[PDB]
Amino acid sequence: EVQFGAYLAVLLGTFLPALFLVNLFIQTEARKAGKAGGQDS
Amino acid sequence: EVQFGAYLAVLLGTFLPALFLVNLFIQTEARKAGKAGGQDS
Amino acid sequence: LTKSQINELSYLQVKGTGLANRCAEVVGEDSIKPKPGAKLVDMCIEPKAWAVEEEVGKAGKTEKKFVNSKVMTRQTYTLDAIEGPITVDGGKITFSEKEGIDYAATTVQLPGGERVPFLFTVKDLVAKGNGDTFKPGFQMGGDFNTPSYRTGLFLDPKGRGGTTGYDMAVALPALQLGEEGDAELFGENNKVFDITQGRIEMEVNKVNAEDSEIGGVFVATQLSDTDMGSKTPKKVLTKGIFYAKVEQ
Amino acid sequence: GLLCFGFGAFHVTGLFGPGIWVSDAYGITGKVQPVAPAWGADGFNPFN
Amino acid sequence: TGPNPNKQAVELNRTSLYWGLLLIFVLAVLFSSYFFN
Amino acid sequence: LFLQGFHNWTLNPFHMMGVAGILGGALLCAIHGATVENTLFEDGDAANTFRAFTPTQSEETYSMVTANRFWSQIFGVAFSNKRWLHFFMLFVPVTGLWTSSIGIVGLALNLRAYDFVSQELRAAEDPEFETFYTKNHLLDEGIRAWMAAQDQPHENFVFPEEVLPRGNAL
Amino acid sequence: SVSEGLSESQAWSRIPDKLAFYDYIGNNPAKGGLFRAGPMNKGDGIAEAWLGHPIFRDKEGRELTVRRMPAFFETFPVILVDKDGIIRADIPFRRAESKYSIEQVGVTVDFYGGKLNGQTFKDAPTVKKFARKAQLGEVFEFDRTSLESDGVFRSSPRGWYTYGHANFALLFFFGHLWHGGRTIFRDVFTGI
Amino acid sequence: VLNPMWRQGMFVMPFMTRLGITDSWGGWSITGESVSNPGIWSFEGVAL
Amino acid sequence: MEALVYTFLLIGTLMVIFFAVFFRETPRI
Amino acid sequence: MEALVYTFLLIGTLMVIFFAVFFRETPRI
Amino acid sequence: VIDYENIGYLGGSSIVDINNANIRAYLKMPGMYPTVAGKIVSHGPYSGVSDLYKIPGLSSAEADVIKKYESRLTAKTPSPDYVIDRINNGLY
Ligand code: CLA
Ligand code: CLA
Ligand code: CLA
Ligand SMILES: CC(C)=CCC/C(C)=C/CC/C(C)=C/CC/C(C)=C/CC/C(C)=C/CC/C(C)=C/CC/C(C)=C/CC/C(C)=C/CC/C(C)=C/CC1=CC(=O)C(C)=C(C)C1=O
Ligand SMILES: CC1=C(/C=C/C(C)=C/C=C/C(C)=C/C=C/C=C(C)/C=C/C=C(C)/C=C/C2=C(C)CCCC2(C)C)C(C)(C)CCC1
């Protein structure tokens, strides 16, 4: 029936860029919190 | 021969925790850089 | 309601009501004693219950049992206006169907989501009564054949058919270009049309002599549809009521 | 405790419930039916 | 509603990152064949 | 019609991207025009609001705040940055066209997204399976066979009546 | 080879298998699909041997030729024409009033120079089978089990290279446009 | 009979059938028989 | 088995849409 | 085809080892 | 069937089968299409061409016009997918 290599293609192409973007957002927010003095270092 | 579901198990279990740890380290470094005044905000 | 009551109703009063499928009842049990050469001008066969032969385990043992099933087509199943000549070979009434609306496409769904289409038909019937006078307690019986559910002009989703259409699966050209080409696919490329057999057993009930009408209960077991030989057909058991009027 | 009492008295004894699955000693004929409680030493039989 | 007074930060050294990466990769190496069977 | 019949161009994902971009561009144009025209400020006394504007104006003519609130209450998300809004308006149709062009370049080499192999098989081994996809394939075969003779006169195609694919009585 | 003087069978048997394999539509780069992944062998199977060149003759001893399908078409009817391009036989789609069916007009095949060299067939179904096979290039023997070859064609490295590189060039034209514009407008590239 | 739930690797279905869930919207029953118009408390109803 | 992948992708897209409406950056003046 | 996965895992582990020696946090007193 | 053997007698050739061809086939023979071809196609299978003349009702004139073209008609084994479509083939 279907190709058994697509699974890897679809799942990796969905997860890896999504985690990359989540990483970018998290580090942006962490830097923003660090710049402003407060309970977060 | 081999199970065609392992591929997903092995690859996801390798990549997702690795990206999670890389995320933690990157956000820690970004917060550290934000805390210290400099060219990075 | 009887035919004498439906004839009072106009077409506008009947549309939608759903009684077009219903068979008229007969009252006033009596004996007809048909004159030889007479024939049944009208004949309605209404199935009241459908069942399909299936395998099911009761207490760790499986056996052939007829499981019930709800009909998917709405109100199509009933046959009507069947005509046939009644004759007497050795003092036995023989219906011998000749013409009339006698087939009806019908689909029924088994438990588990299985859909079983079949052609509910009475064709080339030969009844053999247990005597003469159509009188309360009469029995007819007989055998009939069922034509193919799909005729030669039908086309498969890939465009293959018996009388018309592609002889092979054009979507897969690599199956050609190889000595023994499409063979595994020959079972589906080739469309066969075979007639089946059906057994019906009709028992007569209250018979009106003034209006020359007979009514009763039938039990039929017909062979199901085979998708042009692609699948083995199933066994369908059906029971219901009937009605017929004899013209002398 | 209220929930446990309700489940035991209504949803297992079949007073206001379907019951539980009860089978034969060899697993040939088993089905769901209400079960009457056993207030005796046999109540602690694990297979009762 | 309001700013929660219980919000702290999260840290991870580079040595911790190396330990975690090594652990994940070695676990994958160990179990990959068994998953493939 | 030729590209639809011979390449199944509608099934190509790049064409789908192109049509998405074009329809989104039209959507953005209409919605932005309506939003701007329906959030104008009271800058005159006549019903005709076109004469209450001067080209050498510094202040804004429509309430960005009110439009943002309206669209966030209706749709759930709204713009809050005119620069980003207009860049999005620029970006959508252009990338739609670029994706469509990539698809056409792919078609030029007959590398077309024509068939779903799995469905084609599963339909080949069972004459009861049917989807709208197989119906589209039948339409493509019909259009191709009936159009080739007159579309390509240099090939001298001659198709007898019994060869042309046709359905029932129609 | 006929002119120098030789039997037709041995004249056709001197053709190398490579040359006949080139004259097959499965090797046409403009025949595969975009998402049909894998090598060509996944499409037809590994070629085993040449089946030999078939020759189609009718009752009057003519030489009918099967019209080869063009590259555009994915389904092409089986049509047999003579030396002057006139229809003589075909496979009818609707066999009701067909006057050119392969059975009404008796057509025979005679393979020359191959695995089936010197063999002939007079039966109806086998002639149809071989006509459909020979509609697309030469006839070959394939192994459809080593790679689980499905029934669908695939494309060359030629087509793949051309496709990838043409698309890359088309994108890089845009890249050049944007970057050159950014060089020229450097001072203003921050706000008017 | 020869293909029970435990033979097919079902892990959650036994826990549903233990407490009294036997019918299914598909018309079949785990006890072999057939069900006509099961209620909301079938396998699919429980999952939803 | 690909029905599971399709369903997962569709539900994930719907969840992303959900988070972009009720967990958005509040725009302030 | 799993030989590719095994080789990738081994080479990735070796690369991680490489980065932990020449790109380590310098310990200062 | 993937290949009916009696293709040529369905109407394509000058010889037409009486147990398979549709009524449109009886158009090459003048004076036969209505009231004559209908009787042939509306009745049961025939073992031989002589079985036509016993067709109930067949008038004389019909018998004469059939005898005129008796050479062109032929009798083959019936096939269900074709006998079902004798009256209305489907094509127009
Ligand atoms: C209205 C509430 C409700 C109802 C009627 C059900 C009903 C059901 N659930 Mg369920 N479930 C619910 C809420 C509910 N659930 C919630 C909120 C969750 C999330 C936590 C779950 C998570 C869940 C899972 C993960 C599973 C079910 C399953 C099931 C089915 C089998 C039940 C079973 O065997 O339980 C068995 C229950 C127990 C063994 C609990 C034992 C109680 C312990 C022993 C208490 C001991 C400590 C206690 C405090 C002692 C002190 C009290 C004492 C002094 C009196 C059944 C259809 C199963 C199933 O078939 O899936 C469809 C299954 O696998 N449920
Ligand atoms: C912890 C104890 C416990 C547990 C695990 C169960 C478990 C069960 N009972 Mg039960 N019962 C109990 C205590 C318990 N009962 C008590 C104390 C009583 C006495 C009142 C009963 C009386 C009782 C009766 C009378 C019946 C059951 C039934 C059932 C079964 C189906 C119910 C179900 O799946 O709910 C699952 C419920 C949830 C997961 C809650 C979900 C809530 C959300 C908001 C959705 C609400 C439902 C909504 C309408 C669904 C929308 C979709 C729908 C349109 C398809 C299940 C095995 C039924 C049965 O077996 O029939 C075959 C049945 O008829 N029980
Ligand atoms: C849509 C077309 C287009 C556009 C708008 C631009 C725009 C630009 N290019 Mg350019 N370029 C293009 C296509 C284009 N390019 C192509 C196809 C090439 C490949 C040869 C180049 C190669 C190129 C170089 C090498 C450089 C630029 C540069 C530039 C920038 C400065 C303007 C300039 O020198 O123009 C270039 C002028 C033209 C493109 C006009 C050419 C018109 C010719 C002479 C007509 C010839 C007719 C022909 C003989 C008829 C026979 C052909 C027939 C047989 C088919 C500007 C952003 C410069 C840059 O980035 O500096 C900052 C720069 O150094 N371009
Ligand atoms: C089980 C299920 C769910 C089944 C469904 C399965 C199914 C059918 C799946 C298909 C669904 C799916 C997503 C398929 C489509 C795939 C597809 C073709 C993707 C295209 C991908 C792509 C990269 C295309 C390239 C082109 C491109 C960039 C398109 C983007 C189009 C796009 C997002 C346009 C914007 C649309 C939009 C609604 C904008 C509104 C903006 C807005 C609110 C403005 C209002 C507004 C105006 C003002 O003027 C001011 C001032 C303010 C303030 C203001 O607010
Ligand atoms: C799975 C799959 C597949 C495969 C894929 C692959 C195999 C891929 C690969 C990929 C890759 C493999 C990629 C890579 C990338 C990389 C990168 C991108 C890198 C980067 C780098 C950097 C970042 C660097 C940095 C630095 C350093 C480190 C030091 C000094 C400084 C500097 C900065 C230079 C395919 C498709 C076939 C099919 C389907 C599925």
Tab-separated table of N, CA, C and O and ligand atoms in Angstrom, chain D residues 1-2 4, chain H residues 11-19 21 46-47, ligand 1:
chain	number	residue	atom	x	y	z
D	1	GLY	N	-15.455	6.451	50.600
D	1	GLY	CA	-16.245	5.404	51.225
D	1	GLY	C	-17.671	5.378	50.716
D	1	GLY	O	-18.233	4.306	50.468
D	2	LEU	N	-18.275	6.557	50.548
D	2	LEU	CA	-19.608	6.618	49.954
D	2	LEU	C	-19.607	6.017	48.556
D	2	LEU	O	-20.503	5.238	48.202
D	4	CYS	N	-17.495	3.814	47.262
D	4	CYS	CA	-17.278	2.372	47.334
D	4	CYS	C	-18.554	1.645	47.726
D	4	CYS	O	-18.904	0.616	47.135
H	11	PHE	N	-5.921	-4.688	25.401
H	11	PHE	CA	-5.553	-4.411	26.779
H	11	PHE	C	-6.631	-3.676	27.558
H	11	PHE	O	-6.773	-3.906	28.761
H	12	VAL	N	-7.396	-2.806	26.903
H	12	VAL	CA	-8.363	-1.959	27.588
H	12	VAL	C	-9.750	-2.585	27.508
H	12	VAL	O	-10.545	-2.478	28.450
H	13	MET	N	-10.038	-3.259	26.398
H	13	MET	CA	-11.328	-3.924	26.237
H	13	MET	C	-11.679	-4.886	27.368
H	13	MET	O	-12.853	-4.896	27.782
H	14	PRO	N	-10.768	-5.721	27.888
H	14	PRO	CA	-11.157	-6.585	29.015
H	14	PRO	C	-11.660	-5.816	30.218
H	14	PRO	O	-12.599	-6.264	30.884
H	15	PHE	N	-11.071	-4.657	30.514
H	15	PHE	CA	-11.516	-3.893	31.673
H	15	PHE	C	-12.891	-3.285	31.451
H	15	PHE	O	-13.654	-3.118	32.408
H	16	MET	N	-13.228	-2.946	30.206
H	16	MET	CA	-14.582	-2.492	29.915
H	16	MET	C	-15.580	-3.636	30.037
H	16	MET	O	-16.638	-3.485	30.657
H	17	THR	N	-15.254	-4.795	29.461
H	17	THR	CA	-16.185	-5.917	29.484
H	17	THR	C	-16.336	-6.522	30.870
H	17	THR	O	-17.347	-7.179	31.138
H	18	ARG	N	-15.353	-6.333	31.751
H	18	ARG	CA	-15.453	-6.889	33.093
H	18	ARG	C	-16.603	-6.262	33.869
H	18	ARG	O	-17.323	-6.956	34.594
H	19	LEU	N	-16.793	-4.954	33.727
H	19	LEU	CA	-17.787	-4.234	34.508
H	19	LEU	C	-19.171	-4.233	33.875
H	19	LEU	O	-20.123	-3.778	34.516
H	21	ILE	N	-19.765	-3.832	30.036
H	21	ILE	CA	-19.851	-3.276	28.689
H	21	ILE	C	-19.655	-4.414	27.697
H	21	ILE	O	-18.548	-4.934	27.547
H	46	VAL	N	-18.325	4.750	25.673
H	46	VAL	CA	-17.391	4.882	26.788
H	46	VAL	C	-16.150	5.656	26.358
H	46	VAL	O	-15.681	6.556	27.071
H	47	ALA	N	-15.606	5.328	25.184
H	47	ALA	CA	-14.421	6.033	24.701
H	47	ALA	C	-14.699	7.521	24.521
H	47	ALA	O	-13.906	8.376	24.944
L	1	CLA	C1	-17.760	9.174	36.201
L	1	CLA	C2	-16.518	8.707	36.342
L	1	CLA	C3	-15.968	7.566	35.661
L	1	CLA	C4	-16.539	6.369	35.289
L	1	CLA	C5	-17.897	5.862	35.469
L	1	CLA	C6	-15.475	5.579	34.612
L	1	CLA	C7	-15.673	4.295	34.078
L	1	CLA	C8	-14.687	3.490	33.543
L	1	CLA	N1	-13.356	3.768	33.411
L	1	CLA	MG1	-12.539	5.604	33.968
L	1	CLA	N2	-11.615	7.406	34.458
L	1	CLA	C9	-12.258	8.467	35.032
L	1	CLA	C10	-13.635	8.525	35.388
L	1	CLA	C11	-14.550	7.532	35.214
L	1	CLA	N3	-14.322	6.290	34.585
L	1	CLA	C12	-11.318	9.557	35.242
L	1	CLA	C13	-11.649	10.843	35.848
L	1	CLA	C14	-10.085	9.123	34.762
L	1	CLA	C15	-8.825	9.877	34.758
L	1	CLA	C16	-8.025	9.656	36.016
L	1	CLA	C17	-10.282	7.769	34.266
L	1	CLA	C18	-9.278	6.957	33.718
L	1	CLA	C19	-9.457	5.662	33.290
L	1	CLA	C20	-8.455	4.737	32.719
L	1	CLA	C21	-7.043	5.050	32.527
L	1	CLA	C22	-9.130	3.567	32.438
L	1	CLA	C23	-10.533	3.794	32.830
L	1	CLA	C24	-11.361	2.658	32.573
L	1	CLA	C25	-12.698	2.667	32.850
L	1	CLA	C26	-13.664	1.518	32.602
L	1	CLA	C27	-13.324	0.382	33.544
L	1	CLA	C28	-13.392	0.843	34.984
L	1	CLA	C29	-12.484	0.034	35.852
L	1	CLA	O1	-12.121	-1.133	35.713
L	1	CLA	O2	-12.035	0.734	36.933
L	1	CLA	C30	-11.231	0.006	37.879
L	1	CLA	C31	-11.020	0.920	39.026
L	1	CLA	C32	-10.138	0.667	40.000
L	1	CLA	C33	-9.306	-0.556	40.010
L	1	CLA	C34	-9.963	1.618	41.131
L	1	CLA	C35	-9.688	0.912	42.444
L	1	CLA	C36	-9.819	1.884	43.594
L	1	CLA	C37	-8.618	1.835	44.528
L	1	CLA	C38	-8.303	0.404	44.904
L	1	CLA	C39	-8.882	2.676	45.770
L	1	CLA	C40	-7.938	2.333	46.900
L	1	CLA	C41	-7.654	3.531	47.780
L	1	CLA	C42	-8.890	3.980	48.545
L	1	CLA	C43	-8.815	5.467	48.824
L	1	CLA	C44	-9.053	3.183	49.836
L	1	CLA	C45	-9.803	3.951	50.904
L	1	CLA	C46	-11.300	3.758	50.804
L	1	CLA	C47	-11.786	2.622	51.690
L	1	CLA	C48	-11.410	2.872	53.135
L	1	CLA	C49	-13.287	2.484	51.575
L	1	CLA	C50	-15.037	2.116	32.972
L	1	CLA	C51	-15.930	2.224	31.766
L	1	CLA	C52	-10.465	1.614	31.953
L	1	CLA	C53	-10.916	1.265	30.567
L	1	CLA	O3	-11.391	0.197	30.171
L	1	CLA	O4	-10.758	2.278	29.672
L	1	CLA	C54	-11.849	2.569	28.798
L	1	CLA	C55	-9.034	2.222	31.911
L	1	CLA	O5	-8.057	1.619	31.488
L	1	CLA	N4	-10.712	5.005	33.348
